[PDB]
A paper describes a structure:
We have solved the crystal structures of the MyoVa globular tail domain in complex with Spir-2-GTBM and in complex with Rab11. The MyoV-GTD is composed of two closely apposed subdomains (SD-1 and SD-2). We have also shown that the MyoV-GTD links Spir-2 and Rab11 into a tripartite complex in vitro and in cells. The Spir:MyoV interaction contributes to the motor activation and to the coordination of the specific membrane recruitment of both actin polymerization and motor machineries required for force production powered by MyoV.
A search for the mechanism that controls the targeting of the Spir:FMN complex to Rab11:MyoV vesicles revealed a conserved MyoV globular tail domain binding motif (GTBM) in Spir proteins that mediates a direct interaction between Spir and MyoV. We further characterized the Spir:MyoVa binding by solving a crystal structure of the complex, which allowed us to identify the protein interaction sites and depict the stabilizing interactions within the complex at atomic detail. The Spir-2-GTBM peptide binds to the SD-1 of the MyoVa-GTD in an extended conformation, forming a two-turn alpha helix at the end, in the cleft between helices H3 and H5. Spir-2-GTBM can be accommodated on the surface of MyoVa without conformational changes in the GTD, and the Spir-GTBM binding pocket is structurally conserved in MyoVb and MyoVc. The Spir-2 and MLPH GTBMs exhibit some sequence similarity and comparison of the complex structures shows that their N-terminal regions interact with MyoVa in a very similar way, forming a network of hydrogen bonds with the H4’’-H5-loop and similarly positioning two conserved leucine residues of the motif (L408 and L409 in Spir-2; L188 and L189 in MLPH) within cavities of the MyoVa-GTD surface. Mutation of the two highly conserved Spir leucine residues to alanines significantly impairs Spir-2 binding to MyoV. The Spir-GTBM C-terminal part anchors itself in the MyoVa hydrophobic cleft between helices H3 and H5 using L414 and M417 side chains; and the small side chain of the strictly conserved Ala411 binds in proximity to the MyoVa Tyr1596 side chain. Interestingly, the MyoV-GTD Spir-2 binding site partially overlaps with that of melanophilin (MLPH). The Spir-GTBM interacts with the same binding pocket in the MyoV-GTD SD-1 that can also be occupied by a short N-terminal linker preceding the MyoV-GTD implicated in stabilizing the OFF state of the myosin. Binding of the Spir-GTBM would displace the N-terminal linker and contribute to MyoV activation.
Residue numbers in the entry:
A (entry chain B): 404 to 420
B (entry chain A): 1468 to 1632, 1648 to 1853
The structure:
Amino acid sequence: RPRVLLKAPTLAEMEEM
Amino acid sequence: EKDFQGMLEYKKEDEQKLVKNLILELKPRGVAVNLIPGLPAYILFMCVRHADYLNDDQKVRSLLTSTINSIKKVLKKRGDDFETVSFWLSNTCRFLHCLKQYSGEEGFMKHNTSRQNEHCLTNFDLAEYRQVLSDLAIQIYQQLVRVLENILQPMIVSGMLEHETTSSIADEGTYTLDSILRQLNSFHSVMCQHGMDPELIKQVVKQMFYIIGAITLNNLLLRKDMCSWSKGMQIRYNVSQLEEWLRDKNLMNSGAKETLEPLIQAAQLLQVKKKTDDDAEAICSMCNALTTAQIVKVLNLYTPVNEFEERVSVSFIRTIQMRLRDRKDSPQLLMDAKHIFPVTFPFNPSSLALETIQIPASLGLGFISRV
């Protein structure tokens, strides 16, 4: 099975909300 | 027998209670959480495993985001406590090692048992999340260095330069070398209890020694009374006790002793002969870790022990300046005591079998189910 590369919010983005 | 899968299930409605009890209210010196070093990392990763198993990428995202935000919240509120910062640096790294070890990438599975390889993620590649966690760990490391620096700063000049020489906490209130060593012992014992990677402990200790040497050398260059043969002996003795501490802790290959090379050479400079052209050539050959400005400062400041010893001559100093002319040297006198060597987090897989891990009942995570 293929593993899809998830898009992560950046550390900075998370720092928002 | 029962053979568990090594995963943990929770309901989406409980995600905030999860990070509240596992992160926000977790005590870094609590017994329960220190029975297994890195336990919060292992718990979080086992939760990630079940979200991946459920093919729920939004749940993975939500858990990771809540985790990262909660760790930042803790460090904003308690980031001046070195135990708390050590604890989350260690668990952030262990979480990253888990995400690698159980990624499914062969490069990270070399030390895995057959059982461990059965526990890799199956649906999602979390490399983007590993980068974010790496970035977080860099930030926490930088905060750790600053907290430790703040603790040591008041001790260093007294302990290394001023004070003359079971341990006491101080000598009638004065910080001594023994005060410094006690503090380093505290730091080290906490990093070990938390399961910090040995290669990371080495980097923390190298950084601390750099700071000790930089602050000591700078105050030697800024005072008028610290450049003597006798103070050279005192610095030699103090460095030898710092070296013995590294020995006691099996950290002699950390690179820590080498960061002291400018201070070590300044102390040697105080004790060599300072009159002839052979003496001058020796100084130039010897002092490769000191700038010209530093060598010249020490020679100008140097105080004879008594009348049977003379000051360094102005023509001698000029000879050294001439000899060191084509050095593509920095014109600076002071070491940058705020320099931080770039940190790395080399992969450190663990032998811990996920399917055997038990959550201590005292952590208040009963709403999590073992799978």
